[PDB]
Design a protein. Structure first.
Lengths: 175, 182, 172, 175, 171, 182, 170, 182
């Protein structure tokens, strides 16, 4: 509603979810890419595309229901019904990528970065990386697209993981 | 640093079995989480010092622990206390810091041999699976496992009596004496 | 004073500091630093000698209470008998439950609760308090309802903790 | 399928059959080595090769039908009929090796390791290892193959046991 | 070559063979200490000293033939011929030390450590770690091997002394 | 490395029973905590070295230990010392680092057969729980357990005499000789 | 004396050797504590306290004779002769402390920590030594406390070593 | 794998008593520490193989050992060697690696019955403790103990003659023949 609730949500989120929130709103933020959550929230406020429903959707996509009950005073079912009857701020591709990244540990992300170090810059990934940053780099090289998923599926199957491959195939079949 | 030296000398004389007995008897004041990483007497002494139950001017709990495990020589060699004084202090009601239930359980544990332990484990094959109570665990571990599933406790002793009846009857005499204490 | 705070904070442990932070989470976002936590507590004005005494009594550190705060177990017991202003009974019950679980039990719990929580969040080398806060964020465990925790404790074959939970329910 | 059934199966299995369970799943997932039973079951859950039928087959292999009745709510006749009409999850060679190992005592592993000490060393066979472990070592030395069992047959003949040789002959002639 | 082979090799090997591989490759990559087998193999690939034949020869040294059958699609005859033609990477000294360490049980290494405590400045260890420590103190060298011979003679193990004598007769 | 090799060769000839005897004879310098994780003579030699009671220039304790357990071949082979020299050395006061009480206990341990050992256990059944009635128990373990409950101190020998009076007179003769030496 | 030499020395050393060397160069760190061994080597090289002979001495005191034979083109006999000829950079007190800490076991150091915890407010012996020196309890001239504790923990060989040190230095 | 198969075949035939006899016969090449844990011929054969005294190139040691225990069937079956060949080989000086001391000790032990063994033990009660005089011990154990106590050796044989003079006459003849040969 106001900037006070925006700041309250900003201060109530840890550093781990900051990256997820920034990756979620990359497509919507088409003017500039901000380095902090507060700048992104300010951009949405200035563009007028942020409201109670939009903030509820953003918080529900990251599974922080307690803040929704405390601040937004909505439960899971109400926000689900509201989102299902309203346009989505974030596309299904972004939430699918987030869900895929939510099911990996260090021993698997290390395997992925080691396997795919050849395709991208060897010195570009000197810094420690996560799955979201890896997908960001892949999109920066135009290797993965909302309609292109073969490379991602092959990479997932390379580390002997079928469940995520089945999820990707299901998403492909749904569309 | 004479007190720390005395405590270290006392702890130097305790092997694995006695340390396990001390850990089992001190379950009323040390939770499982703080007890899992304990592997030597120094850690247990530090834990006791944390709750201010053992210190320079308060050795009553240490004396009680050392007497309940029948290490009488350490009582007189270092702490300078004989058996008669310990018995007189303990027989006074309200002065014992260890419940009689734990002492009875420990004493029952001490009076069982390996074949009798196997018989006990076989008799506990009905309520509890044999896998959870295999040859690796000893009697004290079996008692802890029974306590976990609230099949054995301060107010419930029927299963223990029924199981012990198959092995011996003097154990039933000990249980009856404990009941007479209550 | 100020030096007593430094003396207290220098003699704590990592797990003990984590438990203290979890207990103080009741009263915004918790900072990861203990010294910053004490500074913020003093700034907010909720910090008090009796409140700090109760806080240290809740974690079973009577030696520090007598060494620094110059008070015994009876003093903090009387202060609690007055009123437990600082913390709630729910957090005390959570800490008491969390202190009675070993590594195998938390391993089984995180294995059973893999459906609700993703693999990346739990990672490893975590204590029961971490699982508690993870469930709290998802609005699954709260003072109003404890059904999920009760069922989880039943599944891992620990009924004494269920009796503790039922005792807490009957008390309130 | 669910996590509860997996946990119940795990907690009701003794350490004696854990070695057989680990040996049986070597062919299913050979690209990775599982440390213990729980990790192996989680791995098969990840690969999507775990279901009611496969778990029933695995439990039938280790001869623990009481677990099938109490937990899986199935009898061994149903799983036997299902396996007769479905491909085997575990190769017949592995179950044959397990059956042969089950028919030996501690006085035979010493004789076998003494007979074939030239290939290996004292350090490798210093600890007490069952027949399954020795078979795994021989396979790692590429001396025993699913289509090549001459050396093992020779050793079995030399250790004064002919019934096992008859079983080996039956297996070879049947396949 | 491709990262698939390296990943499969890392996943297939266990801890003991990992330690043996680290020791065997220690001599060639003596400039930089590798933290894990993965980093060592990456450095070998980057430096150009790693090829299919070299990797096959290393696996043959570690005695994992099924890996050659499965991953590299080779049999031991081909790698033996390659060793006959192509000069080897790992020296004979390293494979001799591995052979000696293979036959020493858990008890004899403790006795050897007790015997050698006089020269060396200082828990349970493995013979590979012991020989590494000896090499660090410049007591065992590819040309100096009399100390190990005497210490194996005193432990009543004459076959290993015979192996050392045969190796010395080789050069 | 002649000294370490010499010690290793000496330790090569000590089996399990002699190792147990040596461990018992050295309770005055090695506490139970260090005593427990010892299964070969090399660890005992290292422990003695760490206390600087056995080194390159000092070998009196090792000679005394090897003489007390009646092993003179090792003394005459790897140490070049005969019975007469050791006897003259020990007869001189102030040169024996082992108290005569421990030697007397060890000799009584050597002077008991299996049936007499069972009779000894039956006699001690009154004041010692049945847990020590294990068939694996030897006389040295019984003596240690008695020392635990201060019933077999160097000044308290009435129980030992009373139990030994039901077996043989040679044991009483040995005890009387020790008391005469005092 | 080139940058590649110090780079190789810093790279080839291990974590335990790195920590021991970091402790052993405490005296020359009067300006500031070196956060890393590379920083310490750079400071020593730029401050004139580092040389081929000095680097050889430090490598000798950490028991890395392979590096001396391979990197600095020297052997044990020559560096020992140089040590006899020239005064030592580091006093023998630090070397004695390092040798004592290299012999204590984990159980022994834990028992020592428990014994000494009353005086002060997992940790290696070197950490205990630096903590004690922070409290100004043990100094290269006073060693009564450490000697008495070592006697009390039934490790008398190190007590004999300390007595020999005390006799030799004075 | 013909060599190992032949070794296993040879070890299969032997029983416990022959194994104990061989273990006694192999004192100088295998010390007590390695000797005790042996429970079957395979361990002894492996230990001999480690010492490079039993391999494909040199098999005279095994032939001599089997000839000593008077098992000609094993030699003729698993080795196909005649007794006269071994006699001729032993006739050559320096070929036999077993000292005649052990050979004569085994020969003496061969020809003693149980009653004569009891009389022998009774005659040597002075130098042997009662516990080591247990009836289960055979003559080889007595000889081992006497060697240990430095009362019977290669250079000194007075006690053996003194005891044997009251039992049998052929033993004295055997001892005299051994002395004359050396």
């Amino acid at each position: 509603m106001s900037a006070e609730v925006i700041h309250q949500v900003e201060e109530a989120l840890d550093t781990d979810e900051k990256e997820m929130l920034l990756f979620l709103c990359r497509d919507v933020a088409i003017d500039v890419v901000p380095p902090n959550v507060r700048d992104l929230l300010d951009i949405l406020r200035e563009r007028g595309k942020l409201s109670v429903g939009d903030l509820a959707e953003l918080l529900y996509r990251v599974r922080r229901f307690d803040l929704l009950k405390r601040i937004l005073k909505m439960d899971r079912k109400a926000v689900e019904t509201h989102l299902l009857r309203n346009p989505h701020l974030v596309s299904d591709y972004r939430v699918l990528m987030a869900e895929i990244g939510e099911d990996l540990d260090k021993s698997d992300v290390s395997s992925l970065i080691f396997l795919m170090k050849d395709y991208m810059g060897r010195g570009k990934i000197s810094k420690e990386k996560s799955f979201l940053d890896l997908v960001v780099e892949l999109e920066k090289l135009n290797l993965v697209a909302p309609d292109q998923l073969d490379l991602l599926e092959k990479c997932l199957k390379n580390i002997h993981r079928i469940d995520l491959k089945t999820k990707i195939q299901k998403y492909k079949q749904s569309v | 640093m004479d007190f720390s030296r005395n405590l270290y000398d006392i702890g130097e004389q305790l092997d694995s079995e006695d340390l396990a007995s001390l850990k089992f008897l001190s379950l009323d004041y040390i939770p499982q989480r703080k007890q899992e990483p304990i592997k030597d007497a120094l850690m247990l002494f530090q834990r006791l010092q944390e709750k201010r139950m053992l210190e320079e001017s308060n050795l009553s709990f240490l004396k009680e622990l050392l007497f309940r495990i029948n290490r009488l020589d350490l009582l007189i060699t270092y702490l300078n206390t004989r058996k008669e004084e310990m018995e007189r202090e303990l027989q006074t009601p309200g002065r014992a810091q260890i419940s009689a239930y734990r002492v009875m359980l420990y004493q029952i544990s001490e009076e069982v041999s390996r074949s009798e332990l196997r018989s006990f484990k076989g008799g506990l094959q009905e309520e509890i699976s044999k896998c959870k109570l295999d040859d690796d665990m000893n009697l004290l571990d079996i008692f802890i496992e029974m306590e976990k599933r609230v099949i054995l406790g301060e107010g419930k002793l029927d299963i223990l009596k029924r199981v012990c009846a198959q092995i011996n009857k003097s154990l039933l005499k000990i249980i009856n004496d404990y009941e007479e204490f209550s």
